[PDB]
Amino acid sequence: KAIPKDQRATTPYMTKYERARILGTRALQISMNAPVFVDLEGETDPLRIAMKELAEKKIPLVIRRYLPDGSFEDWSVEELIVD
Amino acid sequence: IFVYQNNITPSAMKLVPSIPPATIETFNEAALVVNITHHELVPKHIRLSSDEKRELLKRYRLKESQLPRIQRADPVALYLGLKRGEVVKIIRKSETSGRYASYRICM
Amino acid sequence: MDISKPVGSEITSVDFGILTAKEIRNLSAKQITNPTVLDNLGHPVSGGLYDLALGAFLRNLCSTCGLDEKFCPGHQGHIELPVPCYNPLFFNQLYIYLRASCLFCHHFRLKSVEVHRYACKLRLLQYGLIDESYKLDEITLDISSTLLNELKSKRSEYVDMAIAKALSDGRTTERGSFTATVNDERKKLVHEFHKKLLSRGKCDNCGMFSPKFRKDGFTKIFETALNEKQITNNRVKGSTYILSTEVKNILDTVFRKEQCVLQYVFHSRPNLSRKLVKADSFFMDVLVVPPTRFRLPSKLGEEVHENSQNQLLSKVLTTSLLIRDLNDDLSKLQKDKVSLEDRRVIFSRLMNAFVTIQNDVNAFIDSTKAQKVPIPGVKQALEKKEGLFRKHMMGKRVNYAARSVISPDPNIETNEIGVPPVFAVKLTYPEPVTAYNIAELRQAVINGPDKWPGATQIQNEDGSLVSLIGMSVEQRKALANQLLTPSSNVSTHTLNKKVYRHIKNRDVVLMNRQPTLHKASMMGHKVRVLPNEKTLRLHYANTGAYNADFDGDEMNMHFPQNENARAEALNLANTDSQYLTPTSGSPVRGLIQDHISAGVWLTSKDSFFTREQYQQYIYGCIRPEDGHTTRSKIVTLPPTIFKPYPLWTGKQIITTVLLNVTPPDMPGINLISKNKIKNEYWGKGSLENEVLFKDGALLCGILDKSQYGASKYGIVHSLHEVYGPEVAAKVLSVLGRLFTNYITATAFTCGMDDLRLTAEGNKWRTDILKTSVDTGREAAAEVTNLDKDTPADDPELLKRLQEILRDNNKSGILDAVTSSKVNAITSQVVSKCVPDGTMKKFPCNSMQAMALSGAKGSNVNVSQIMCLLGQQALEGRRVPVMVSGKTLPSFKPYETDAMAGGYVKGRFYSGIKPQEYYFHCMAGREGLIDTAVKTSRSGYLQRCLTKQLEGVHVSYDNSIRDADGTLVQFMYGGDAIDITKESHMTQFEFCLDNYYALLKKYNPSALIEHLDVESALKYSKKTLKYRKKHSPHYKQSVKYDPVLAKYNPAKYLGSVSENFQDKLESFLDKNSKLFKSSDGVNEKKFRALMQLKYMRSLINPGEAVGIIASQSVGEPSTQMNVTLGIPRLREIVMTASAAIKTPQMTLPIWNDVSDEQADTFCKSISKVLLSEVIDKVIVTETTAARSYVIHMRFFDNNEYSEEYDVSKEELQNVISNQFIHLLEAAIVKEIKKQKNMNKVQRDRQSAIISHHRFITKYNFDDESGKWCEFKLELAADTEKLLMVNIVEEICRKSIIRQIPHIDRCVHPEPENGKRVLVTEGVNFQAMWDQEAFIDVDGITSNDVAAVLKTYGVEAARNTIVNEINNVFSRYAISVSFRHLDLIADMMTRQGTYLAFNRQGMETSTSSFMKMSYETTCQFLTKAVLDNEREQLDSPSARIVVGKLNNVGTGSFDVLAKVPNA
Amino acid sequence: VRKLLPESWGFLCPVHTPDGSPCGLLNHFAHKCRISTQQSDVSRIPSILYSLGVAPA
RNA sequence: AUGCGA
Ligand SMILES: [Zn+2]
Ligand SMILES: [Zn+2]
Predict the structure, then answer these.
(1) Interface residue A7 vs chain C (CB under 8 A)
(2) Chain C residues inside the 8 Å CB shell of A76
(3) Crossing angle, helix C1220-1234 and helix C1283-1291, to 10 degrees?
(4) Which nucleotide is nearest to D20 (CA to C1')?
């Protein structure tokens, strides 16, 4: 099932759905006391915090893009063109 | 290719499959009066090779049975002589994309 | 749900399979034997239906776990059925297998070697090796046992080889092979197999004669006697009722002896469990007992009624106890009692009792299988409208939800929702407390449940809940200092407390308005709590997406409880992401009514404003403190007029707002749009339709619905395109405030003065309306076909008009012609009056303003008030007429006045005469009927294909795969373009006037490092060469696929449709002179920009394009010679009917084909019935045979020769050969119902007598053909018949000329295309012989099935997409071709015309999706009988198991990178 | 069945009709409509008809 | 289930 990193063939861009799930799950982690890797800068909404974390790509999440075969491509946030 | 004039008897139709040495195809002399591949709604059907088929099945990571189907008794399958398993590439002109390449598996 | 309580044991699939009595007895918590339910008048009977082993009850703990009614999950008991009975669900199955066996050998009556061949085919189809399954048939060679064993050896060898190859080749696996086509080939094989199994009407393996088996229907099988020829044949080869027990004892042994085939017959996939196939699966030796939890009584307000399950189950237990009592009789009798026939009655007890208990089990299963409002069984409980699946699984009630009447409010954002403080204090979010939110949640707790952003409850990390419903400020104060307490238990150290905070101004909420008709009708809005409200407050801009109106409309407000649902409702479903519909990509969100008329008034060159007024309107619409700007200060323009006084225009105000809402780092939007107001209205030289936007500054024209509401390139659409949805939304809120405030300063009104015409306008109106008096009768005499000015009282006119009244078609012509003429009078009246004759014009006239700007109204409405109502119609034609010939009592019979037909000359401003009020009442009512029925014909259109395409989504490879994985399309619409992006993808000039802005959006230097900018561009150069080389369709140089086939269009910039590439290059060439007017942009940097726009406009991996398609075909079909509208769409999509109601075949006629030749061919193909040529038939029945002298007096030879192009000789052949033979056969059939004269003519008559047994004479008008007389003589024994009626019937059954299936060829007027002839029938083979007039390559048809049979699958596919495109085009609806093209590809996924109903659904692979549509129990039965396994791919199926949906955000997984040191 | 017919002029109201499923099914009598509640003088009508020239059946 | 609101 492991698509080799040299062989990843999918869209270099983060889909709106990918961005949505990343921001939701990571926000939920910050709201459950995941260590924040950026200045809280006053904020109280965990979702806006996760948005800041996306803006600095500090997010430590990986997207597993599935292919209907079952092969998948592990992509970092730090590479997938956020927008 | 066996072009009958009016009919072939079902007993002879039991002879049609009887020589796995060489395919036998029966055709109606009245149904040959027009080349359906002549028609404006029928895009270009191209028979794929065994290697172009194996490549197609690799690029999309899927089984043969998961492609779109073309019936074995489809007139166009009868024209091209499609055997079972044969994939045909259909180049159709689309009202939006222009030339568009689709595929069909003959099963 | 709680995020604090994870699980990591998710269900991955669902296996189906039959239970076993030993399994039930082993798991069973108890045997229930006592038909009692309650005891001691108030206690659960021991070992009865309400034993505590079946769960907790009445504070009695579950006797099987000791758990309370609030804790015990309950446990399932079982009943030891007296006999075995029959499983109803498989009764149809076991009956077949009973009919399939041999009773003297106990084998299948099909050849054993042929059976083994069937096992081979089904084994190859478990692994889905179809090509090999068909290749098996070829293995071929009194038949020796060595030879039949040689066939079994060779076939097993083929199975072993084809398997060894396929497992070696990985083309399958130990786990089988399962796909839609494999399922279909299995159902086809198993069907032919069952036909062969049933075909043997005597055995073959043993040669024995099995009895015929009959059944009662659901409780008894009988065994028919045999014939002494077959019984003595059985000896030389040497109706009775049977019990379920005997069937079980036979079928056990038969199912064991045929286990070898049935191993694959009863599995669609390899039976890894080596499960024996037992006959006890179709019979019930035992009955289970559901949990008491699900058997609680029906208490309705006060009344406690026993559960219907208790009743039917108690009936099984009572009847079973009676049969147990008969077994008491066996202990009773059966010592020997040698001659006590007394048991002859107990034998009536056995037959009656046994059928009775069986019937009662049936009734408990299915009420419609027993024998006045019978309590429902589980089959009724699961299906129909409810289908437990539909009412509580595919849709449910939900918590954290409210419903309320919506109220308008322009001061909120266009993306927000005004929540009344009852909801703000009654809706909570479970907020985990941290170091960053401790202050806010401590305060919210301090406020308490009875305040604003307080909080209703606190959930500890230990799991316990502490309600604040009644705590005092002191106690809540105490808890506020404990929200941050330390850990206490290692079991809980990882958690943090939760606070159920009220909904507040930082939460997103999902608003839904019933109609759901489309995904755009349920969006996420940002909550804004409004004080002293009681209604859900909504901005006007959303009302055209919900199709909502403050008339009384109610809306559902859903509050999501999870950061995943928050993030999605703020990022995916949010209103801004819904500015365009996927149906067409036209904006559905804009300002409305008053805001439109306010924009029309403010933007007039006549509107000036003083510095005070201008600045006031500006801060009125822009609040920098609200984040309404990208400047943090305010900026302003110089006045339009420096002079006498500093003056600003309204267009300068729109300039100021646009200059203040757009980002300072970007140039102003440049647009040339148009208005809905012709320039003529602003003067003889005024120019106000050209809307001009230069660098952010409106320089000419006004704004209206066409601009910021029209959602068609206008201003708002252009801002959406250039700066994106956040800016366009900001623009909408700013405009809504600007126009609301300006409507506060100047307002808008309408009144009677706005409705009057001048004395002149009434002079023209009355003068033109004097001309309809001739029109009424003039048309009546045109349709009647009588001389001009024919008196309105001519008696012949009245008789002709009665002839017309009695004919519905002639009346249709009279209505249609009178309608066209009086409608010509209407058109005259309006075109003369209206805009010129009004008492006050334009601006000065608000009534005209609202229709002409398109704020509200139409020019039709304005003409209906100011001019005339005009012709009323019903179902497409004029007023109904009474059988007396009167359309109203006050009208004399056949009144030729236009008014008497329903033409109302009166208008709403001066009223309508009562005779006219009855007609406008007719049209208005029939309108309300159409309005009330259209919504029932669009629900089934939505759901019928929405069930099918819900699995249909975008694979990550851009290919469209279903949730199964079966590929539907290799690209979306063949371009991978998102409709919600495409709108400007082909508007190059606009992009050019805004080049630098789009270069600032899609700046490539950020991305040019992640992709390739050459490979695709190079393929584009070589392919553009080969494409210009081959720029005939099917004799081109096929060698180069399109660039989209060879490179992922998201990865190598330049992989684009050849249509888009072609249009772009052609634009760059045709504007090289515009490329000689620019500051310096070039077709390579501009072409690079447009390629990058194309890459950035592609459909995202995981898009729910199936559902989007289904809604984009359904939703617009609610607004709705051949079948049109919903019945046509149903005829295609819903049924894929091989029998169109109006099958037509279009025939293109060669350029060389004359019009006169075309009319000759139209006559030459149309059918001509014999009836059509007969003028009169005289039968002189004389009866001493019974003489029938049948005289057929035809038309004149030249009459039928000029209408049907047939001769008297053809009439001779048809009469002498066809007509007579059919009539003579009909006369013989009527008997069964009972029980001059020249030599050549004489030879014909005698010869026809010699060909027909009844006929005696034959005299024919050989001089013209005017009649055909033949004498028929019958014996007295013939009694009586209605010979005239027989003749008539044969006349309409005799044809001079008929092309099979083709009725008529008509010559419609050519339009928008080549000359063609439209036939009313479909027969391609027949047009193939007509090639000398018809370019066969250009024949088309509305009949999908006929195309599939003749021209193949791609032609039927293109016919579907064309036919549906025609259906929507008829209603002038835009629908993206990508939707129709997807739907067509899905209907042809198997190479056929696979409709979207249950029949087509059968072949889909998800058993739960089948279960959850229709015939739930039938799909369940076919699934269990297969031993099917659900791979849980269907979105519906996945919902059934409570699994993350695989579409969209669930199309992938998220993992985390974690430091290891 | 729901089509408003001209026979109803003066008997059923052309505008008193619900909106929805019942539309056309739930008519309303006109404000001047009456319903016969008896029957009368049928016995003398034959005598006058016979006098008017009706031939006895 | 009937009527009915949207
Ligand atoms: Zn229990
Ligand atoms: Zn037998």
Answers:
(1) no
(2) 1457
(3) 140
(4) E4
Say how far apart CA C1069 and CA C1067 lie, in whole Å.
5
Structure tokens at C1232: 């069964």
Q: How far away, in angstroms, is C951 Cα from ligand 1 center?
A: 39
Resolution in A: 3.8
Tokens linked to C877: 């034609």
Of C1424, C1432, C1416, C1422, give the one whose Cα is nearest residue C17: C1424
CB of A47 closer than 8 Å to CB of C563: yes
- What domain range includes position A9? 1-83
What is the domain count for chain A? Answer: 1
Return positions of chain E under 7 A from a protein CB: 3-6
Q: Is C731 exposed, middle or buried (0-12, 13-18, 19+ CB in 10 A)?
A: buried
Contacts with C959 from chain B: Cβ below 8 Å: 60
State the structure-solving technique: cryo-EM
Q: Which neighbouring-strand residues pair with C287? A: C79
Backbone angles phi, psi at C1321, to 5 degrees: 170, 170
Please give the Cα distance from C319 to C35 (Å, whole number).
Answer: 9
CA atoms of C1433 and C962, how far apart (whole Å): 9
CATH of domain C427-503: 3.30.1490.180
Q: Which residues of C touch D24 (CB under 8 A)?
A: 925, 929
Q: What is the CATH number of the domain that holds A66?
A: 3.90.940.10
Answer yes or no: are the C-beta atoms of C32 and C293 closer than 8 Å: no
Q: Which of C1173, C1177, C1216, C1224 is nearest to C1196 (CA)?
A: C1173
| Residue D23 CA: distances (Å) to CA of C912, C927, D14 | 24, 11, 11
Hey, what CATH topology would domain C579-749 get? Answer: Enzyme I; Chain A, domain 2 (1.10.274)
- For the structural domain made of C750-913, what CATH number should be given? 1.10.132.30
Helix pair angle (C795-806, C808-832), 10° resolution: 110
Per CATH, which fold does C976-1100 belong to?
Answer: Tetracycline Repressor; domain 2 (1.10.357)
Chains B and D touch (3+ CB pairs under 8 A): no
Given a contact cutoff of 8 angstroms between Cβ atoms, the answer to whether C1296 and C1169 are in contact is yes
**Fold adopted by B35-107:** Eukaryotic RPB6 RNA polymerase subunit (3.90.940)
How many CB pairs lie under 8 A apart between chains A and B?
Answer: 7
- Spell out the SS3 assignment of C1318-1342: EEEECCHHHHHCCCCCECHHHCEEC
C173 Rama class: left (phi>0) / alpha (psi -120 to 50) / beta: beta
CA pair distance C1153, C1330, nearest whole angstrom: 12
Q: Which residues of C866-882 are buried (b: 16+ CB within 10 A; e: fewer)?
A: bbbbbbbbbeebbbbbb
H or E element, residue C1456: strand C1452-1456
What span, in angstroms and rounded, lies between the C-alpha atoms of C690 and C1128? 41
CATH code that applies to domain C400-426+504-578: 2.40.40.20
In the sheet that C690-694 helps form, which strands lie side by side, from edge to edge? C671-674, C690-694, C697-700
Mutate to test the interface with B, among A1, A69, A72 (most CBs of B within 10 A): A69
Q: Is residue A81 packed enough to be buried (19+ CB in 10 Å), middle (13-18) or exposed (0-12)?
A: middle
Structure tokens at C675: 């208005």
Compute the distance between CA of residue C904 and CA of residue C917 in angstroms, rounded to an integer: 8
Q: Which residue in D3, D19, D20 is closest to C926 by CB distance?
A: D3
User: Rounded to an integer, what distance in angstroms lies between the CA atom of residue C1453 and that of residue D2?
Assistant: 57
Task: Determine the distance in angstroms separating the CA of B61 from the nearest CA of chain A, rounded to an integer.
Answer: 6
Instruction: Spell out a b/e string for B5-27, using b for 16 or more CB atoms within 10 Å of the CB, else e.
Output: eeebeeeeeeeeeeeeeeeeeee
CA of residue C1125 to C1' of nucleotide E3, angstroms: 32
D12, β-bridge pairs:
D29
